[PDB]
């Protein structure tokens, strides 16, 4: 089961961009994978300062690192007993969801697709498949098998809606449409694109003062999707 | 002595200046801006000081850029013409070295080309056909001032200061006068901002100014009248251009 950690490209405003288009040209990518989260370490005052003040000491005497050790004995399960825990629970129980709990995902997956449906009417720019669904599902059972319980629970459910529900928040969040003309070059320009090509608006914005890697493809996909 | 009174006679008057505009280049016709670009490399800068340090600059360079016809070219046959210690080439087929040396092997060193002329004005034609390979050269030559020489034997380091006069077709040869002139001439950034300044010239039909080309360009065929003469003759300028060569200004 892959775990993967991507790196997104220019910054913040990739999220003032589409959610999706990040990666490559294509956001297939994102709908292959369940659980998409981009995200903050937004430091409760007490982390930038908890890696600060251990930056300025690192040194003696070892209290620090001491603190770390007495985190592992107390820090919950040893992590080496996790471990063992894990390959137990794997091997022995595979559990299995209940009647109510699968209705109410039903009421769950409808929603969904009505509402952000609905949100799409604007086109939207962004995502729903019944892969998302049985992600959820999946989640339910992994819970459940916490629990290490041979049968699932509403409430056990109710967590992971909202849990795949901070996902969606995560799949939620020169001009582009001067430079998305190439309209005006793609006609009375180009009826063939030959000879036009990524190279001809290279020549075309490339001594007008304008066009960006990621501009230039942005307005492109843009085009390409817009259907001009 | 005889001469020194003609100098002297040329120094006093107001106008020498625009006699010596006007009698530049006398088979061209007009344009009275490539007329002061043409001499203003001749008659160059300080080009020297301010230490402690790196040195400053000094001579000048040139390129006219237009649509063919406008006979660019009649400006630089008239330089390797009227000044002494001028190459010219047509480069494209600089090739290579060409405007650098080889250098013979031993170590005897070829001229050649672009370092030959030394302290003078280089003429290319054509900056756009000669593509990457020498214009790198050239930037090297305008802006380490040095060319360094190292080839399977004997290391070297050979000074050539100069002036670049280039003459160089547009993209469609055309303008394109809505397009910026950076991305008209189509050579590379560096060396581009390295000419200072272009003089850009196009040519537009004016009936006046027609009348005026057909009739002076018959003119020209004509072995009468050739009597069409520029009010200084091409002898005596340079011995002038020399004599205000001497000063410090």
Known sequence: SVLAAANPIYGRYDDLKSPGDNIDFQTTILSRFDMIFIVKDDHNEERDISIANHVINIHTGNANAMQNQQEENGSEISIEKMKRYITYCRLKCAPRLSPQAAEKLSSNFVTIRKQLLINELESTERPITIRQLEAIIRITESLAKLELSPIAQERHVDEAIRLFQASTMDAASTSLSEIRRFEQELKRRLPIGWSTSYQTLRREFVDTHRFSQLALDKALYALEKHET | ?249
């Open chain 2, 1 to 249: 002595s005889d001469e020194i009174n003609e100098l002297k006679e040329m120094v006093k008057d107001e106008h020498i200046y625009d006699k010596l505009v006007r009698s530049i280049a006398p088979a061209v016709f007009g344009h009275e801006a490539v007329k002061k670009g043409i001499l203003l490399q001749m008659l160059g800068g300080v080009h020297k000081s301010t230490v402690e340090g790196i040195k400053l600059r000094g001579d000048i360079n040139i390129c006219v850029v237009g649509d063919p016809s406008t006979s660019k070219s009649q400006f630089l046959k008239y330089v390797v013409g009227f000044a002494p210690r001028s190459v010219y080439t047509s480069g494209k087929a600089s090739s290579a070295a060409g405007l650098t040396a080889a250098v013979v092997r031993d170590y005897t060193i070829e001229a050649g080309a672009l370092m030959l002329a030394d302290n003078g004005i280089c003429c290319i034609d054509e900056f756009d056909k000669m593509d990457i390979s020498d214009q790198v050269a050239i930037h090297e030559a305008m802006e380490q001032q040095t060319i360094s020489i190292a080839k399977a034997g004997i290391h070297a380091t050979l000074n050539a200061r100069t002036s670049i006069l280039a003459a160089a077709n547009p993209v469609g040869g055309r303008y394109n006068r809505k397009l910026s002139l950076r991305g008209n001439l189509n050579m590379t950034a560096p060396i581009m901002s390295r000419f200072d300044l272009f003089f850009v010239i196009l040519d537009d039909c004016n009936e006046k100014i027609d009348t005026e080309l057909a009739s002076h360009i018959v003119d020209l065929h004509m072995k009468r009248d050739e009597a069409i003469e520029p009010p200084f003759s091409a002898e005596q300028l340079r011995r002038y251009i020399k004599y205000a060569r001497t000063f410090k200004p």
